[PDB]
Amino acid sequence: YGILFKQEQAHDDAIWSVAWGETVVTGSLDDLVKVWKWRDERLDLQWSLEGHQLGVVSVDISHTLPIAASSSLDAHIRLWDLENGKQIKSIDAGPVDAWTLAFSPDSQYLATGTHVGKVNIFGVESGKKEYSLDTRGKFILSIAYSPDGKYLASGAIDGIINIFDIATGKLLHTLEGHAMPIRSLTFSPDSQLLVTASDDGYIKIYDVQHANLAGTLSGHASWVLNVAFCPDDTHFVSSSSDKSVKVWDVGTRTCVHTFFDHQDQVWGVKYNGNGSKIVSVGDDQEIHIYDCP
Numbered sequence: 001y002g003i004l005f006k007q008e009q010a011h012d013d014a015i016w017s018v019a020w021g022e023t024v025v026t027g028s029l030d031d032l033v034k035v036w037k038w039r040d041e042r043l044d045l046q047w048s049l050e051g052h053q054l055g056v057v058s059v060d061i062s063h064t065l066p067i068a069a070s071s072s073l074d075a076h077i078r079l080w081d082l083e084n085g086k087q088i089k090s091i092d093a094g095p096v097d098a099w100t101l102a103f104s105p106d107s108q109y110l111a112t113g114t115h116v117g118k119v120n121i122f123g124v125e126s127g128k129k130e131y132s133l134d135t136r137g138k139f140i141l142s143i144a145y146s147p148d149g150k151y152l153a154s155g156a157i158d159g160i161i162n163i164f165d166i167a168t169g170k171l172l173h174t175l176e177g178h179a180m181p182i183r184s185l186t187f188s189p190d191s192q193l194l195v196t197a198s199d200d201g202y203i204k205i206y207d208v209q210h211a212n213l214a215g216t217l218s219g220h221a222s223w224v225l226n227v228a229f230c231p232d233d234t235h236f237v238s239s240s241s242d243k244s245v246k247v248w249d250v251g252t253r254t255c256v257h258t259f260f261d262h263q264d265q266v267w268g269v270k271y272n273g274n275g276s277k278i279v280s281v282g283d284d285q286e287i288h289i290y291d292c293p
Contacts, residue, residue, distance in 0.1 A: 115139045
């Protein structure tokens, strides 16, 4: 493991979210969505996407199509054409009704968490709200689709996690788990495990089928801001307010590596397509790319 490339001043304010598709997409409070090309060991900026009127909260990239989606504090979601750097369309989510974004496995739907306790599912082609999942709870700070397309999970500001059945729209389970905010959750590539991160500094691992807690990892000294899975289905990576990025072994439930070369909160981490690179972004406005064996 090791630091491979650093882009200083990637953005002009905090970068809260990043997605890896060759192509890295970053969302920042400076209002911009930037598209970066990872090629021959280098990162180089391709597009600077203007349109949002206020800071960007979340971004995602479609798995099948060359598009990215951003949500912003300006109450809009924008879809972006990655091939030519232009905006496809802009959707009025509503005031604080658009926090974190995620494309569905097939990129026909885009889900967003709301301040009112709902997960709003938007249609990529139609631009309209196609349906809503209701937790009946509190500010939803994280959402995740299970790769297999069977489930959606949402983590709330008061520590409640909800697992929905995406084909019936019914709430299948509601977990107490944490009592602090859950700013990130992610399903594993085989859709069997659900890993959740929390302000309490603990990462919790749930089996999805039985819905029970499998383990808890200590290792972050402050808020866990992000968790993301390695394609090889065994590793995941976490980032935190404590300025560190950690790589974990799902099987042994232990830390394999920590990177400390960030000087502020690290908000975003993802593995690339073959799990040989990790990208990290945060408050220090830098993009780091790490090499993995």
